[PDB]
Structures are given as C-alpha cells and as structure tokens.
Amino acid sequence: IIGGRESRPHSRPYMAYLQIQSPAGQSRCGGFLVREDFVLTAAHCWGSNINVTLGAHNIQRRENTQQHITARRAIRHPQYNQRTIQNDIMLLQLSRRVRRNRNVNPVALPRAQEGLRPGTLCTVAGWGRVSMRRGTDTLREVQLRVQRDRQCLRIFGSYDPRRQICVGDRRERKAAFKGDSGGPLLCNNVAHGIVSYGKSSGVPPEVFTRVSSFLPWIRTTMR
C-alpha cells in the first residue's frame, strides 16, 4: 500500500494473509473472507500449498488472535488468462471453518452486475509494499477514488470494463502495489474489487477485479 496509513489493529477481520511461499515461489498475497470456509483472492496468487491466516495485523508476530488455517483447495477461474490477465479471481476453501469473532468475520459481497460509477471513494487494505525499497509487517490501507474506464483504456492493453475496474487517481502517489494482489477494494462497506495488476511503477490508475461480475461462479463454486 503506497501512501497509505496503518489500519487500526483488527479493524478489518475479513482481511486474509496469503503465504504462497511453498508450492509457487514465496511472495505474500492479499485476500478477504467471503464465507466461513472461503477466502477470495486473485487467481494469480495461486500455489500448490497456501497457508491463510485470519485475524491478524502484524504477520511478523505470533498474535493470539491470529488464525493459521491452510487452504484445502485453491480454485482458479476456468477462464483465467495469463497473457491478458482476464478473469483474475480465485477462491480458497480453508481446511476448516474459521472461528467467527470480533477479529475474524466475512465481508459482504456486492450484487450481480452491481456497477461502481467513477468518483466513488473506496478503501483498499493489505500488507503489500509501501514502496519499492521498503515494506511493512503491519496491515496498512488507503482510499482510492474509482476513475472512469476511459483512463485505464488508454493505459493498459487488455482492460475489460465488464470484469475489470479502473481505480486510483494518477494525481495522487497512493495506490495498491506489490504484495497487495488479492486485497479487496471495499466501497460502501462492500468488497467490490480485487487488486489484480497495474503499472510496475506503482503509479495509478490501477486495474482491479470486478467481483460483481463473477458472482454466478462465486456462488456456484462455494455452493
């Protein structure tokens, strides 16, 4: 999270910490609790052995509130393109049901086809890198004004306004970055997007996954 500020310890229970460090490289990832035994994260944060941890703030410290539940099944989107980076969404069925508490509890998802007009004020969180020189052990966050699909349409190559979202204001040196991939973009207390990709420079706008479009699959997969 570039330009963001540290979140109030456990202010975001649904915030999950991905640890792909085992079956596919070793680079932390974001994710949010959508259900009791399901976590939503980018389809690229995949691994053959992911260890999710709920109810945390500082991953570099053994918090008694922390919940270390391994991923029993990391499902990727049937049409997740690796070249165009489309359908970048993945669900993680924990090996057990999280113990819902003030520190751990699912987040409300948006409705099908639920749009997100530009000018909206969203908030993204995650333990991602604050910069390309330093990182962070404690979950940080920042607000991102959703911009029109016009911008990202003249920046990124494979950008679909139907399944992707154009977030982040270029005029501001603040936005999701390396390590935030998977973190949800909550707008109106509703996880609307998922940090997909962006300019390797960390300079916004950036691309976010439109969850409201992958509802059918989301439900079908969990159900």
Ligand SMILES: O=C(c1ccc2ccccc2c1)[C@@H](c1cccc2ccccc12)P(=O)(O)O
């Ligand atoms: O390289 C990445 C990257 C780079 C620049 C960024 C700029 C702004 C916002 C996010 C950005 C993310 C990701 C990443 C790592 C490793 C493999 C990936 C495969 C597909 C998509 C992302 C992947 P990440 O390590 O999962 O975080």
